[PDB]
Design a protein around this nucleic acid. Structure first.
Ligand SMILES: Nc1ccn([C@H]2C[C@H](O)[C@@H](COP(=O)(O)OP(=O)(O)OP(=O)(O)O)O2)c(=O)n1
Ligand SMILES: [Mg+2]
Ligand code: NA
Ligand code: NA
Ligand code: NA
Ligand code: NA
Ligand code: NA
Length: 326
DNA sequence: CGGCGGTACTG
DNA sequence: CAGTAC
DNA sequence: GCCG
């Protein structure tokens, strides 16, 4: 119900600019403001009406006026010419703002320049090889097929293994950027040392095509981030993320993996205000932090058998996954 | 003034 | 560790 | 960038 497209559309450009240039916190600031402007049913009409909105300050409001009066944003006319290129570069999986700026500094301007002259990490080479594929979203139906493929291979050597697709899929989105599969076991122990068996099985059938993050020399590997592709014609390579967690950490793992990211952050920001701490591992109470919000004391873990418990313990009304898109 | 989430790999 | 990612 |  965004009644401010002509405002946000201009700010979103400025937000991405700051983000690719590495100005993370300023970009965060814009992100929340833009998010707000898309929830305010009524189109802001005053410099005051703006300030009155959570996530919008004087600085933000001021430029909302220039867009309301001048119909344009002077700032947008002074965005470095490097931005489009930095965004192109940072869209390579494994390359971030630091690598993008370095490459730009070295004179690179195109993926052809990267391909032929840039020094790439193993991850970046895989990301460049699937540059277009990784920017595409798949229909959820395909995500289902991928989850099913992973689940089938998992339950093959242990029918007790519980498998659930999380991320945007569980939140009910029509399309998914990748597939997030959480795996755990109700007996609280058979979930150990399975990555070896599962990944091996998924490779045997040729389902996995590339590995981005897979610390298989360690028996305590928690996640696998890779690339897969279903069989048959017209198939594209898709990003696949898999996490194996202890049953005791199931709810926190599920909540985390379901997101959204912004939802997780506000949830964790809240827990911190209540002297608590939430992670994909567990919800803790009586956590000791210093003047800089740094955890100095671990506190203790609270029993959270279900997601409802997490919300409850935080003094919050439960939210269906679909209601966690922020 | 100064935090803005809390984690897990890589090299 | 810094960088990048979920 | 916002905000306590
Ligand atoms: N910075 C981040 C990124 C991700 N996540 C968590 C919440 C996400 O829902 C989940 C999976 O990450 P994805 O990047 O796959 O996010 P989504 O699945 O939500 O979106 P997409 O549809 O783009 O895959 O990991 C997080 O807590 N913090
Ligand atoms: Mg996802
Ligand atoms: Na406000
Ligand atoms: Na990237
Ligand atoms: Na993901
Ligand atoms: Na590895
Ligand atoms: Na400025």
């Amino acid at each position: 119900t965004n009644h401010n497209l002509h405002i946000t559309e201009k700010l979103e450009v400025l937000a991405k600019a700051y983000s690719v240039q590495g100005d993370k916190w300023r970009a965060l600031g814009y992100a929340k403001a833009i998010n707000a402007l898309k929830s305010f049913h009524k189109p802001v009409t005053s410099y005051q009406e703006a300030c009155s909105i959570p996530g919008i300050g004087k600085r933000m409001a001021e430029k909302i006026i220039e867009i309301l009066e001048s119909g344009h944003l002077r700032k947008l006319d002074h965005i470095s010419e490097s931005v489009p290129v930095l965004e192109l570069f940072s869209n390579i999986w494994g390359a971030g703002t630091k690598t993008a700026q370095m490459w730009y500094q070295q004179g690179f301007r195109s993926l052809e320049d990267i391909r032929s002259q840039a020094s790439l990490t193993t991850q970046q080479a895989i990301g460049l090889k699937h540059y277009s594929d990784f920017l595409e979203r798949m229909p959820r139906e395909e995500a289902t097929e991928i989850e099913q493929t992973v689940q089938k291979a998992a339950q093959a050597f242990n029918s007790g293994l519980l498998c659930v697709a999380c991320g945007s899929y569980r939140r009910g989105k029509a399309t998914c950027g990748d597939v997030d599969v959480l795996i755990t076991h109700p007996d609280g122990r058979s979930h150990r040392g399975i990555f070896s068996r599962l990944l091996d099985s998924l490779r045997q059938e040729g389902f996995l095509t590339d590995d981005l993050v897979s610390q298989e020399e360690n028996g305590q590997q928690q996640k696998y981030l890779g690339v897969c592709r279903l069989p048959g014609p017209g198939r594209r390579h898709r990003r696949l993320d898999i996490i194996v967690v202890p049953y005791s950490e199931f709810a926190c793992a599920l909540l985390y993996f379901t997101g959204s990211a912004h939802f997780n952050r506000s949830m964790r920001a809240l827990a911190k205000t209540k002297g608590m701490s939430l992670s994909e591992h567990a919800l803790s109470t009586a956590v000791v932090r210093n003047t800089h919000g740094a955890k100095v004391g671990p506190g203790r873990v609270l029993p959270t058998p279900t997601e409802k418990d997490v919300f409850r313990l935080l003094g919050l009304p439960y939210r269906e996954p679909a209601e966690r898109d922020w």
